[PDB]
């Protein structure tokens, strides 16, 4: 038998199965093959189109094809044109989502197949889904690279640009998930999904630098991509990759993101452990289940409640439906990995479960269910009984996605084509070819990092240049660099805002956002003129920490490390450094000399650097082209001077020279009169700005902080810090110690956060806002470079941190009065923060250690699992400080490693007012857990009162000191906080005594 | 936990019996009775057995 018979058999199978139900009016396949359903999904039709394209490519190898490739290629083109038309039908939603990403403004995903219109409201679907758009982009660039023509005019290029801009911001907004259910509770909440972000990263990488028109194209067929978004997506993947979601330990939806459709996980060993884990935890006799504890269309499920009631998931386990389609995906992965053993085993497993039509055509049903007779028998013996096939397994109903995957897998298994043909864009590469790829790996090899970064020295003033030359430091003032131009960072953002504008539809282009250091490290050509920019760290900043040489040195070192470790483009990066004559400011001129000498030496903390003139570096280097533009103490107190008349305050402002008094008078004037009042030095706002700039020049930290509180300004980096804290797994609370506090659990827009923090600031204090700004930026930087230092942290509270800081500083002061925190330099606050954040050692009073540990809300490693195993062996429950933790709801709702229990236990633990009391309580809990796990014979007879136990230990140690040191009964238990846990007579022994006494009774 | 010196078994029996007498006086309002026949009567295991008093004596001796 020649190839003709097999190809004709595949053609008849496709005609009788896939293309039979195609809608000619739109080219979109429906979700149901019977009943005249008007609902259509995006994934199934796209997969069918991909399978048809694969079959056409397979049949292309015959010159006497009789035009059979023709109908398949044109069907793919018609489907893609229809889906593109349906996407472009909705235009207002895209613009709304580009500015304010919300479920209300999300792009609709389901619409009528007869006329391409919406049939169902967004209150019953959600409609928010990004994986479909990313997969559509990946496939469209796939077939464009193949040789197919889908785009005609320049308008679709602009639409693709807008779609890329919209999908760039997917790493923050939570999604409803591939299964539409999101959280396993199915209550109406959205959680982050690793598969969606992985697909987005793959599409963003693939779309970069590609000609959309195919064979012909000069200057209007390219796509521009920002590297910062790709870097952030990769970071989010690497952080969230081990666990698909916070509420889901493992799901079966991870395979397509880590298989042929994506090929996104280039880590081999972590890939192997993920594959082993998913196979071990999700293997079934009839295939792969979606994930654990899943009551999807099962026997007990009823069509009367969209949202599942709590504790129903516990009853829903053990009767999970079965999907054999994933055997085909594992078959695909095995065949691309060249492992015929997996191919044969999975084919043998698939052979009996497959069904036949009247003519014997293969059938792959959707899901498998157990009859009502084996509802309880199946629970005792997993898989003992036999399930039953679904409705779409006999006749009249099909699952077109299933037969599409089956036919593509059979086509690959029969060796009728090659993996290269189906992947012209080489998404998957072997280990021996991973040497000189773009956006993925460096030329030095995967397990190597020896990049050399180019740095250019440019002066600012001729006097500074000659002064540096007198000491041997060589630098060039900008006036001899006439052919080259140096521009700030706002030129590039305005230029990027210029592009992507269309008049017919209404288009705002790229949003005005700051550009990262990687983007500015490149060289630009505008109107034929070379443009080079320096990182945003050198430009003038109204803030105050930019006046400290140590902070700038640390920041530039961090930037150099970041450039070294996240650079993969062809060619050495370009770095520009500028030195101002105001930086020297007398005696401060030594550290900059040392840094320049070290830079000249060649190595900066293990990083190789090169220095030379700008003209040689710019010559012989690739310059990227932007051609779109051508086509297109105080003596004044608040209380005493509050009631003074306006003229008296104005005269006092006139005749006073103290900065603090001037600032407080300006504050009183703005609070009483308003910002629009006119003073002797212009408007109130102008005078405030002038005095703030003068204070910044004079480096009065209290004055600059108070002026900053006046200026109503904020840093443009809080959102990355909050989102990286959220994706790490920690929680952030903004507020003041001893006052109201706001808890953040999901990413929020900067406007809401700024509003809430500034209303709180107006309520309680004056100069705090800049203080929490400094603490949060420092904490984010430390967690970025030293992540293990914050180990054991769950809820971070800036107010408690700064209170502990002030307490430690007061202890250090001793006899001398405690130095005010508002007057501390940035270097001093950084050093003190690093000191207090240290793991701490002995020598100091153990009470202070307890206080600082409790203020940070420190928890021991493995505390949560110990609490869980305690409650499992606690028939009654645990009651601490008036809060109750009933065992039944938490056992029937929760499981071992899920985060909701950790949140609940932290909530019930956080009611303790005294932090060292909380630490004593957690130590007691750990001791109880250890002693109970060491001996299973002894069990609790009733609920335990931890307050009673700590009071008993209090009395016992009071008696012991009375016997030993002849100390009378003293109120308060502070001497215990002084007493170390371990030693001759520690707290742990007394905790063990109390536990032994409780168990004996 | 390790012993610091030689243990006196007779002493330990004496603390166990004294604690048993204190518990009996607290519970059943029984005065101090000579001889250990009451302690001999009590089973080693139960709600309050001899093993519990022996463990109390052991922990008291180890702690000191």
With an 8 Å Cβ cutoff, are B63 and A996 in contact?
Answer: no
Q: How many residues does chain A have?
A: 1001
Question: How far is it, in rounded angstroms, from Cα A237 to Cα A270?
Answer: 12
The partner residues of A879 in beta bridges, in order of sequence, read: A884, A945
Query: Using CB atoms within 10 A of its CB, is residue A852 exposed (0-12), middle (13-18) or buried (19+)?
Result: buried
Measured between alpha carbons, how far is residue A554 from residues A45, A89, A146, A605 in Å? 53, 51, 49, 11
Q: What is the 3-state secondary structure (H, E, C) of A922-986?
A: HHHHHHHHHHHHHCCCCCCCCCEEHHHHHHHHHHHHHHHHHHHCCCCCCCCCHHHHHCCCCCCCC
C-beta neighbour count of A70 within 10 angstroms: 11
**Technique behind the model:** cryo-EM
Chain A CA closest to residue B59: A993
Q: What is the 3-state secondary structure (H, E, C) of A324-379?
A: CHHHHHHHHHHHHCCCHHHHHHHHHHHHHHCEECCCCCEECCCCEECCHHHCCHHH
Q: What DSSP designation does A300 have?
A: S
Which residues from B are below 8 Å from A when comparing CB atoms? 52, 55-56, 59, 63
**Beta carbons of A80 and A106 less than 8 angstroms apart:** no
Question: How far is it, in rounded angstroms, from Cα A663 to Cα A636?
Answer: 10
Measured between alpha carbons, how far is residue A103 from residues A107, A124, A189, A450, A641 in Å? 8, 12, 11, 45, 51
Chain B CA closest to residue A997: B56
Taking only Cα atoms into account, the Rg of chain A, rounded to an integer number of angstroms, comes to: 34
Nearest chain B CA: its distance from A989 CA (Å): 9
Question: How far is it, in rounded angstroms, from Cα A249 to Cα A898?
Answer: 8
* Secondary structure (DSSP) of chain B: ---SS---HHHHHHHHHHHHHHHHHHHH------SSHHHHHS-SSSSS-HHHHHHHHHHHHHH-
With an 8 Å Cβ cutoff, are B56 and A993 in contact?
Answer: no
Contacts of A271 (CB under 8 A, 6+ apart): A258, A265
Chain B CA closest to residue A986: B63
Nearest chain A CA: its distance from B62 CA (Å): 11
Instruction: Count CB pairs under 8 A between chains A and B.
Output: 7
Measured between alpha carbons, how far is residue A841 from residues A386, A926, A963 in Å? 62, 21, 30
**Facing B52 at nearest CB: one of A989, A993, A1000:** A1000
Nearest chain A CA: its distance from B46 CA (Å): 11
**Beta carbons of A504 and A552 less than 8 angstroms apart:** no
**Strand A485-486 vs strand A529-532: parallel, antiparallel, or unpaired?**
parallel
C-beta neighbour count of A705 within 10 angstroms: 24
**Beta carbons of A599 and A611 less than 8 angstroms apart:** yes
Question: How far is it, in rounded angstroms, from Cα A722 to Cα A831?
Answer: 23
Which residue is it, tokens 């056992």? A891
Q: Is A886 helix (H, G, I), strand (E, B) or coil?
A: strand
Spell out which residues of chain B touch residue A989, defining contact as CB-CB under 8 Å.
63
Question: How far is it, in rounded angstroms, from Cα A916 to Cα A853?
Answer: 8
Written as six digits, the tokens of A910 are 């956080």
Spell out which residues of chain B touch residue A993, defining contact as CB-CB under 8 Å.
59, 63
Phi, psi (5° rounding) for residue A414? -75, 0
**Beta carbons of A524 and A492 less than 8 angstroms apart:** yes
Q: Is A877 helix (H, G, I), strand (E, B) or coil?
A: strand
C-beta neighbour count of A662 within 10 angstroms: 21
Nearest chain A CA: its distance from B52 CA (Å): 7
Spell out which residues of chain B touch residue A1000, defining contact as CB-CB under 8 Å.
52, 55-56
Which residue stretches of A258-311 are H helix?
Answer: 269-282
**Strand A678-679 vs strand A682-683: parallel, antiparallel, or unpaired?**
antiparallel
- Select from A778, A716, A723 the least CA-distant residue to A745: A723
Mutate to test the interface with B, among A931, A998, A1000 (most CBs of B within 10 A): A1000
Taking only Cα atoms into account, the Rg of chain B, rounded to an integer number of angstroms, comes to: 13
Q: What DSSP designation does A35 have?
A: T
Q: How many residues does chain B have?
A: 64
* Secondary structure (DSSP) of A393-416: GTSS---HHHHHHHHHHHHHHTTS
Phi, psi (5° rounding) for residue A119? -110, -25
- Select from A782, A780, A784 the least CA-distant residue to A838: A782
Chain A CA closest to residue B52: A1000
Resolution of the experimental structure, in angstroms: 4.2
Measured between alpha carbons, how far is residue A862 from residues A299, A903, A926 in Å? 38, 15, 9
Spell out which residues of chain A touch residue B56, defining contact as CB-CB under 8 Å.
1000
Spell out which residues of chain B touch residue A996, defining contact as CB-CB under 8 Å.
59
Nearest chain B CA: its distance from A971 CA (Å): 26
Nearest chain A CA: its distance from B33 CA (Å): 24
Chain B CA closest to residue A985: B63
Mutate to test the interface with A, among B16, B53, B59 (most CBs of A within 10 A): B59
Q: Which long-range contacts (CB under 8 A, 24 or more apart) does A334-337 make?
A: A335/A409, A335/A412, A335/A413, A336/A260, A336/A419, A336/A428
C-beta neighbour count of A897 within 10 angstroms: 12
With an 8 Å Cβ cutoff, are A1000 and B63 in contact?
Answer: no
**Beta carbons of A914 and A908 less than 8 angstroms apart:** no
Spell out which residues of chain A touch residue B63, defining contact as CB-CB under 8 Å.
989, 993
Q: Is A216 helix (H, G, I), strand (E, B) or coil?
A: coil
**Beta carbons of A167 and A204 less than 8 angstroms apart:** yes
Nearest chain A CA: its distance from B37 CA (Å): 24
Contacts of A838 (CB under 8 A, 6+ apart): A789
Residue A876: alpha-carbon gap to chain centroid: 40
**Beta carbons of A48 and A18 less than 8 angstroms apart:** yes
Written as six digits, the tokens of A267 are 């880590």
Spell out which residues of chain A touch residue B55, defining contact as CB-CB under 8 Å.
1000
- Select from A15, A44, A50 the least CA-distant residue to A29: A44
Residue A371 zone, left/alpha/beta (φ > 0; ψ -120 to 50; rest): beta
Written as six digits, the tokens of A136 are 């559509």
Written as six digits, the tokens of A503 are 């008049």
The CA-based angle A812-A818-A822, given to 5 degrees, is 115
Of the CA atoms within 13 Å of residue A890, those in its CB half-sphere come to: 25
The partner residues of A454 in beta bridges, in order of sequence, read: A574, A610
C-beta neighbour count of A925 within 10 angstroms: 21
Nearest chain A CA: its distance from B9 CA (Å): 22
* Secondary structure (DSSP) of A451-509: --EEEEEE-S-HHHHHHHHHTT-----GGG-TTSEE--SHHHHHHHHHSS--TTTT---
Written as six digits, the tokens of A684 are 């109130």
Chain A CA closest to residue B47: A1001
- Select from A754, A734, A729, A756 the least CA-distant residue to A744: A734
With an 8 Å Cβ cutoff, are B63 and A993 in contact?
Answer: yes
Which residues from A are below 8 Å from B when comparing CB atoms? 989, 993, 996, 1000
Nearest chain A CA: its distance from B31 CA (Å): 23
Q: Is A531 helix (H, G, I), strand (E, B) or coil?
A: strand
Helix (H) or strand (E) holding A879: strand A877-880
- Select from A110, A101, A130 the least CA-distant residue to A203: A130
Question: How far is it, in rounded angstroms, from Cα A205 to Cα A201?
Answer: 6
With an 8 Å Cβ cutoff, are A1000 and B59 in contact?
Answer: no
Sheet with A795-797, edge to edge strand ranges = A741-744, A731-735, A795-797
Question: How far is it, in rounded angstroms, from Cα A665 to Cα A778?
Answer: 32
Taken in order A758, A764, A765, A770, the sign of the CA dihedral is negative
């Amino acid at each position: 038998e020649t190839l003709w018979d097999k190809l004709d058999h595949y053609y008849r199978i496709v005609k009788s199965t896939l293309l039979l139900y195609q809608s000619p009016t739109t080219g979109l396949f429906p979700t149901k093959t019977c009943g005249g359903d008007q609902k259509a999904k995006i994934q199934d039709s796209l997969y069918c189109a991909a399978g048809a394209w694969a079959l056409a490519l397979a049949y292309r190898r015959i010159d006497d094809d009789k035009g059979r490739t023709h109908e398949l290629e044109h069907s793919a083109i018609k489907c893609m044109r229809g889906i593109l038309y349906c996407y472009m039908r909705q235009a207002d939603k895209v613009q709304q989502f580009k500015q304010d990403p919300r479920p209300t403004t999300c792009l609709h995903s389901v619409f009528n197949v007869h006329t391409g219109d919406e049939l169902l409201s967004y209150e019953e679907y959600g409609h928010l889904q990004i994986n479909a758009v990313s997969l559509y982009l990946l496939y469209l660039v796939e077939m464009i690279s193949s040789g197919l023509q889908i785009i005609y005019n320049t308008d679709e290029v602009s639409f693709i640009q807008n779609l890329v801009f919209c999908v760039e911001r997917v790493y923050r907004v939570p999604d409803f998930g591939v299964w539409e259910r999101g959280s396993k509770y199915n209550n109406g909440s959205t959680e982050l999904h690793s598969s969606s972000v992985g697909l987005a990263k793959a599409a963003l990488e693939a779309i970069n630098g590609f000609n959309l028109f195919g064979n012909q194209g000069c200057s209007w067929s390219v796509i521009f991509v920002d590297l910062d978004a790709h870097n952030r997506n990769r970071q989010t993947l690497c952080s969230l990759l081990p666990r698909e979601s916070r509420s889901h330990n493992t799901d079966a939806a991870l395979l397509p993101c880590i298989s042929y459709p994506a090929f996104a996980l280039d880590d081999e060993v972590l890939f192997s452990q993920t594959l082993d884990k998913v196979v071990r935890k999700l293997k079934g006799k009839y295939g792969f289940k979606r994930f654990l504890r899943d009551g999807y269309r099962t026997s007990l499920e009823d069509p009367n409640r969209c949202y599942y009631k709590p504790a129903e998931i516990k009853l829903f386990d053990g009767i999970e439906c079965e999907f054999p389609i994933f055997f085909l995906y594992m078959m695909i992965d095995g065949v691309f990995r060249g492992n015929p053993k997996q191919v044969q085993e999975y084919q043998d497993l698939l052979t009996p479960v497959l069904h036949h039509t009247t003519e014997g055509y293969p059938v792959v049903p959707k899901y498998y269910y157990v009859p009502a007779d084996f509802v309880e028998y199946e629970k005792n013996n997993p898989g003992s009984q036999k399930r039953f096939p679904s409705n779409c397994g006999r006749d009249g109903k099909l699952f077109l996605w299933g037969q599409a995957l089956y036919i593509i897998a059979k086509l690959l298994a029969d060796e009728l084509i090659s993996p290269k043909d189906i992947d012209p864009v080489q998404r998957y590469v072997p280990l021996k070819d991973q040497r000189n790829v773009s956006m993925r790996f460096s030329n030095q090899g995967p397990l190597e990092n020896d990049l050399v970064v180019h740095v250019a020295l440019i002066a600012e003033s001729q006097r500074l240049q000659v002064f540096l030359n007198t000491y041997g430091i060589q630098t060039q003032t900008p006036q001899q660099v006439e052919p080259i131009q140096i521009w700030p960072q706002q030129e590039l953002v305005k230029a990027y805002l210029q592009l992507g504008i269309n008049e017919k539809l209404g288009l705002s282009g790229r949003p005005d956002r700051p550009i990262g250091c990687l983007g500015t490290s490149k060289i630009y050509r505008i109107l034929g003129k070379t443009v080079v920019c320096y990182p945003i760290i050198f430009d003038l900043s109204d803030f105050y920490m930019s006046q400290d040489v140590f902070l700038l040195i640390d920041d530039i070192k961090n930037a150099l490390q970041f450039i070294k470790q996240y650079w993969k483009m062809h060619g050495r990066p370009l770095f520009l450094v500028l030195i101002r004559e105001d930086n020297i400011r007398g005696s401060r001129f030594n550290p900059i000399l040392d840094m320049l000498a070290a830079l000249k030496k060649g190595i900066i903390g293990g990083v190789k650097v090169h220095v030379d003139r700008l003209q040689t570096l710019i010559s012989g280097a690739v310059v990227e082209q932007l051609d779109f533009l051508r086509i297109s103490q105080p003596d004044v107190n608040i209380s005493e001077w509050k009631d003074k008349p306006t003229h008296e305050i104005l005269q006092k402002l006139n005749d006073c020279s103290c900065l603090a008094s001037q600032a407080i008078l300006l504050g009183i004037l703005l609070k009483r009169e308003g910002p629009n009042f006119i003073t002797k030095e212009g408007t109130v706002s102008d005078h405030i700005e002038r005095v703030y700039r003068r204070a910044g020049s004079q480096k009065l930290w209290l004055a600059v902080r108070y002026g900053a509180a006046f200026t109503q300004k904020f840093s443009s980096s809080i959102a990355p810090h909050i989102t990286t804290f959220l994706v790490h797994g920690k929680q952030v609370t903004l507020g003041a110690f001893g006052h109201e506090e706001e808890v953040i659990s999901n990413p929020l827009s900067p406007r809401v956060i700024q509003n809430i923090i500034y209303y709180k600031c107006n309520t309680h204090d004056e100069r705090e806002a800049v203080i929490q700004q400094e603490l949060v930026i420092h904490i984010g930087w430390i967690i970025s470079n030293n992540p293990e230092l914050f180990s054991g942290m769950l809820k971070i509270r800036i107010g408690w941190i700064i209170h502990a800081m002030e307490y430690e500083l007061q202890i250090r002061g001793g006899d001398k009065p405690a130095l005010d925190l508002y007057q501390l330099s940035p270097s001093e606050v950084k050093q003190l923060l690093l000191d207090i954040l240290q793991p701490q050692q002995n020598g100091r009073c153990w009470l202070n250690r307890r206080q600082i540990d409790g203020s940070l809300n420190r928890t021991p490693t493995g505390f949560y699992d110990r609490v869980w195993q305690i409650l499992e062996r606690t028939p009654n429950g645990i009651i601490v400080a008036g809060k109750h933790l009933p065992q039944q709801p938490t056992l029937s709702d929760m499981t071992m490693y899920e985060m909701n229990f950790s949140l609940l236990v932290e909530d019930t633990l956080g009611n303790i007012d005294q932090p060292q009391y909380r630490q004593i309580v957690v130590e007691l809990l750990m001791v109880v857990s250890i002693v109970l796990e060491r001996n299973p014979e002894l069990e609790f007879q009733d609920k335990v009162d931890l307050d009673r136990l700590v009071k008993e230990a209090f009395n016992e140690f009071q008696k012991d000191q009375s016997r030993l040191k002849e100390i009378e009964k003293q109120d308060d238990m502070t001497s215990f906080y002084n007493t170390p846990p371990l030693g001759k007579r520690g707290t742990c022994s007394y905790l063990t005594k109390a536990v032994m006494n409780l168990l004996l009774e």
